[PDB]
Structure formats: structure tokens, C-alpha cells
Symmetry: D2
Subunit: 225 residues, 4 copies
């Protein structure tokens, strides 16, 4: 994947609505695609300060930055120069849902993200609308081919002020802009993620996030096969 | 609201994405707000023809047109001149999800809708993407106050070619732009809907829809004297 | 059309189950008017009482023969006798609890007989159900059509809470006849309006009387199409 | 510091046997199963030999019952407290609902006890709405992939969240997820609760006979924290 260098920059545009609060964000980032690490610096540029926890947006800000181990084919790095899209719905156990659609392209050496967010039904006294959340635990995504692309299933735990967790889960479809004939698809595998907030300011209108992500098989040996 | 006359027109703009496919629609319509009937004439103006059944968009194109029976307060008509919003997620039994957020306003005597659609994960070879659908049956929405607005719960049956159905359900929150103290909130009630397609052309890039909607209580007697 | 189902019928029920990991058994006796769609059941918790959860979560598990089928809608349940029928259902509450139930309905010496198994899980420890903050169900409208070799129902119900709020639940049911499909006239798409009410209680909900009225009908609104 | 290996759960030996009784219904098909097994509780490995003793042959894929047949056999690494092994002699329960993407649901409740040195399981199954033409009722499934369960305290016990992939005849997968609550019969004051952590599982069918009325299953299960470093110093 020669177009994806050891170090890459990214730029992002996001617009969305959560319940009926409209906003726009931009971000600039850098990372090491083959090491599976990256940092994004994010600005809320319209609609700030947001009345909901920024944590619900965190997964919507970068699939080229996954260290693919154990010979697992890399759906995302193979997709350049054409790029790829993703689409996702996250459901929170207390009723809120966050839907996101995303385009990833490569333009003059910079990876470009365009994201649309539609979140609905977040409960008025829930931790998200009360801004009583404290970031995500690590998680393991489970992936396999489906629907002409790559399906992901994830489950994440959101830390709460006062202790304990709010659960969510999401279903993602990643779609390449290359035709299947020109891709080596992975089989069933996992991606371990640790998505962290490293800095913030001004009531979450400035946020820095770091992610480490590694594609791998399960640690445990198989009796069969 | 006296601002809502016995006959009203509406205009709509919509933009969205379904499974990576971007599109825009506009529409014009007319209806009888107190009688609960309306017709909208819809154009796909960008991104057409759509690669999915237009039926999944039908509920996203009008809450001021509900006949409120039995004295049930009308959350929507009371909200003018300020207007109201709605937000919704529809989940289909085969994996698709259709999220929508909407703004309703009143401008120069015309009701104005602005809608954003985000649909994801519709199965690639399923009924929606293969255009095997034939419109909706009637349904009964269940409503009550929640979350600082009015909560709706709906379950609908989409007719399929060959005679079956595809199930979906949705959860809606309707929010007024008037403060709660200036509204008479309804209690628990139902709205019966019949949302029908009455014309189409050009691979569903022109569609006409009619809806009738009537708010009511359950008319079965109650041993406990409840509505 | 269904000679075995008389204007007045009696019922007897046995139920065993677990909610979270609390085991219990119930019995009940009832009577109703199958063609008028009304019935009353008098229910006893006979093992495992008092229950640590609101009895409201069990209400829908205690009677499909008692629905007034209007407008010519075929009656899947009354037609199923003498062989009888079964139902299976999962109810999901918005705060995480789930209540699964499977039921057998038979007719024995002129009495309708119910055998029910309940498995409820993950009800939140400090939630409305375990803290007994519930006040019975609102009315509701079930939506039905054939599927999976039987009759599919979809329901959504609102549980009243102390203080005036609601807890939502929904459920999916499959009703299955013990008659072969060839010997049944299947209904098409239709609704059943229900009003399920508690009329008496004693002894920390270890004695409960419930009444239900149920009516099968089409939507009242006219169609432009068809 | 305890003086002896495994001093924090002495009734659980390095080798243990188990016996199980199960009864249930799927759609409205009633059945009963029994099983006997053995495993190495601290190593996280075990094998169960299962018989369908009433209601066989089953008209649905046995794969949907696989997770209902053993929490004492998890290798807890990295010092993670072992909720299950700590719970003896009193034992523990679990309760779970599994939702399949094509509409079927499999609910299960379970009691675990220790009787004369043998671990005893009593399980109740209630499965509903499995679609008539789905892979489960058509018996077109081919066992589970590995998975990673996510766990943390909640509801006075230990919450688990799981997502699994069921291999299908012809290729591809059917998705399910489940939510579990594990509950100790010891009071909270006598337990050292773990924090947030993961359990990797690989649940495999190693033998079957007579239209799935005899099945042998092996499982390996290992509790761990996420491997990856944390910029914030978290586990």
C-alpha cells in the first residue's frame, strides 16, 4: 500500500444533529498507519458548546491506522487510492442512538474524512445529556466479510461520574471503493482498540483523542482444524 | 393555534444518506390539519434514482395534520408560531436502520420541513435494496410525555412482493419550541395512521403520498375507569 | 363455527418460572365469554411468594381464546380446537429486563387448560420492577399477520409508574396451531385491541385477579388504495 | 499472603468434575439433557459430554444450546479476582438472553452448586421465535468462532456482554449477542469483586453422534485486561 506512508496526516469535516442540536466539527490529525496509532485534534466550530457528552462522538472521528498482524489482509490500506466508506449505528442501553456515515479519501497525500452524524432519543436525565461521562474503556471489535464489504460488531463501556458504566453496542459496515475482484479480503478476525481522550478545553469544544488499534486472531488455540 | 387554518400548504427540503448513497429531495403538499388528511408531492432532486425502496423514506416526509378526537390536546398545533422538531430511529428486522431528524416551522403562512436522513446497514441483497416492497399497512402509534417532549412508539408492516411482510419499529421524540409552561400536554393516547403511496414515476424519483392520522383513546371499557 | 368453544368457558392454569434467579410457581382459575372477548382470572402464587418483582411483568403470561373477532376476521385460536395451540414470546423492557414465556393451550373435559413456562432475566436491581413502583398497564393495540408457520404478533405496552411516568416494553409473539395449516382459515393482517387490568390484589401480590377485554379488528381509517 | 496455592478458593481443585441437568423449550419443542464433564479450573479448560435424553432428536441446531452447558473453569490472569471460584461453597447463578439477528431468542437461567466435590449445574432454557427458514431451524450451522466477553460489576453481581459469530453451511455467519448477569450466593461483603475486564472464549464441538443427541464440547476461557498501553495509565 505505497500511498500509505509510515507517517500520515488527516483532515476531517463533520456535521450533525444530536436530538435536535445541530453542530459542526473539524479536525487535523497525524498517525503511524502500520503501528496502529494516531492523534486527532478536534474543534467544535458550530453549535458549541454541545449540550451532550462529547464521548458519544469519539468513534466517529479512522480505519487506515490499524496495525494488521498475523498476516490478516488490510481492507482499508488496500482500498487506496480510491478509498472507502463506513456506516454505523450505536445503540445505548438507556435509549439513545447515534448513527454515523463516513467517507474516507486521499487527496494530495492527506487522508480526508467527511462525516455525517444523526443521534436521537438521548434521555434527558441520562449521563450523556447530563454530561456525566468519563471516557471509554478498551474494547475488542469482531469482524468478518458481509454485505459486499466488511462487517464489524462492537460493544463498549462508557465510564460514569460516580462509578459504573453505560453500555452501548454498534454494528458497522465498511465498504471499499475498489471492486471485490481487486481486493484480498480478510476472514473472521478481531481488532483490539483503546480510544482515549488526552486533552480537552472550553467545555469540550476542543478535544484531542488518541487511538491504538491492532487486528489479530483470538489468543486461544483451537482443538479443531 | 389560530395560525393553523383548516387548509394549509407545506414545503420540504431533505438531505441524507442510505448505505453510502447520498441524495436530496424536495416536496410540496397541502392538507386539512384538523381533519387529519394531507397529500405530499415529492421529487428526488439529487442522487436519483435511489438504489433502495423509497418506502423506507415515507415516514420522514408531517405532524400538524392529525385529527385530535376526544379532546386530546394537540401538541403540534399548539406549538406554533415557534414550531417543533422530531427525531426518530426505525429498525428493520433484517438489519437496516433509518435515522431521521426534522425541523418544522411556519413561514409566510406555509409549513416548512427540513429533514436529515441517515440510514445504515440495509442488507445488500434484501427486500429494501432489491426493491421488493409494496407500501405500508396501517398502524397505531402509542404516545405519552417523556424526555421533555412527547414520545411515540410505532410498529409497522411493509408489504413484500409475493405476499409477506417485513417488520420495523421506531421510537420518536417530538419536541416543542414553546416552553412546557405554555403547552397543555396530552396524556397517554394513540394515533392511528394510514400512509399510502398514490402515484409514482421515474424509478421513484417522483412520488405522491397521502396520509390520514387520527388521535384517540382506546374505546374498550375500563374496569378501573381509565381512559 | 367453533362448536367446542361455548358462550361461557372456564380455564385452569399452571405456571412455573424464574425471574433473575428467583423461582416460583402459580396457579389460576378463570372464566370468560370467548365471543365477547372478556375474561377474568384469579391467580395464586403457590411457591416462591412473595415475589421480589412487580407482578405486572407476568400479566400477559396468564388467554387467546377470549378475543371477539369482528369484521369477518378468521379466529386462529377458536378454530384450533380440539387440538389446541401454543404461544411463545419475548418481552423486552427499555431498562434492560427481559421476560420470555412459552405456553401450551389445550381443552380437557370442556375446560381450557394453560401450562406456562417463564424465564425472565437482567431486571435492574434498583429499577421500577424490582422496587415495585409500577401501577399496571395502559391499553394497547397488537399488530398481527401470518409468519413462520403460525400467526405473528407485535406488541408495545406502557407500564404506569408511581409519580405519573411510564416504562416501555415491546414483545414479539408467535402463535402456533396444533391443527395443520390446510385445516385452518388463516387471517391476514389485522389488529387486536387489548385492555389488560388488575381488579384485585392481596398478600403482597400472591393473590391477583386480572380482567382482559380483547377485540380483533381492522384499522378504522379508510384506504385511498385497493 | 495466603500460604498455599489457590488458598483464595480451596474447594476448587486443579481437576474437577461436573454434572448437569437441563430442561427447556425452543419454539415449543420441549427437551431435557444431561451431561458429565471434567476440567482444569485454573487452566481455563474443560470438556463436557452431553446427552439429549428427552425430546430428541431436536429439530433445531444444537449450537444454540452450546453456551448454556460452566464459569468455574476460567483462567484468571493478571490478578483479576475470580468471582466464581470465590463463591464456593455457596455457589452462584447466571441468567442470560441471546438475541440472533434473524429473530430467534434463547433465554437461559442457571444454578451452580458444589455437592460432595462435584460441581452441579441445573439449567432452564426458553427459546422463542426462531424463524422457520433460518439456519437454526434448518440445521444449517457449523459451530462458533472465538469471542471476547466484556465484564464489569452491575446489578449486585457481575455483568457480561458477548457477541458471537455462528458459522453457516455455504459460508458466512449469523450474528448473535447476549447479556448475562452472574450472581454470587455469597454476600457482597465476603467477595472481592473484579473491575472491568475481558474473557476470551473458544467454545468448540469436538464430537457428535446420532443427530446431535450426543455432543462433546470443549471450552477454553481466559480472563485478562486489554494488552494495549494506555495514555491515561488505565488497565
Amino acid at each position: 500500500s505505497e500511498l500509505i506512508k509510515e507517517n500520515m496526516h488527516m483532515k476531517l469535516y463533520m456535521e450533525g444533529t444530536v436530538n435536535n442540536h445541530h453542530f459542526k466539527c473539524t479536525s487535523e490529525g497525524e498517525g503511524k498507519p502500520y503501528e496502529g496509532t494516531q492523534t486527532m485534534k478536534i474543534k467544535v466550530v458550530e453549535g458549541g458548546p454541545l449540550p451532550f457528552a462529547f464521548d458519544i462522538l469519539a468513534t466517529s472521528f479512522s480505519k487506515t491506522f490499524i496495525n494488521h498482524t498475523q498476516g490478516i489482509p488490510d481492507f482499508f490500506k488496500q482500498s487506496f487510492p480510491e478509498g472507502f466508506t463506513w456506516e454505523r449505528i450505536t445503540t445505548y442501553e438507556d435509549g439513545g442512538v447515534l448513527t454515523a456515515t463516513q467517507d474516507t479519501s486521499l487527496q494530495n497525500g492527506c487522508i480526508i474524512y467527511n462525516v455525517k452524524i444523526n443521534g436521537v432519543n438521548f434521555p434527558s436525565n441520562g449521563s450523556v445529556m447530563q454530561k456525566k461521562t468519563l471516557g471509554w474503556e478498551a474494547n475488542t471489535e469482531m469482524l468478518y466479510p458481509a454485505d459486499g464489504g466488511l462487517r464489524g460488531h462492537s460493544q463498549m463501556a462508557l465510564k460514569l461520574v460516580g462509578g459504573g458504566y453505560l453500555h452501548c453496542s454498534f454494528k458497522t459496515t465498511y465498504r471499499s471503493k475498489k471492486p471485490a475482484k481487486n481486493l484480498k479480503m480478510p476472514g473472521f478476525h478481531f481488532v483490539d482498540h483503546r480510544l482515549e481522550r488526552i486533552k480537552e478545553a472550553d467545555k469540550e469544544t476542543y478535544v484531542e483523542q488518541h487511538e491504538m488499534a491492532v487486528a489479530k486472531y483470538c489468543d486461544l488455540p483451537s482443538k479443531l482444524g
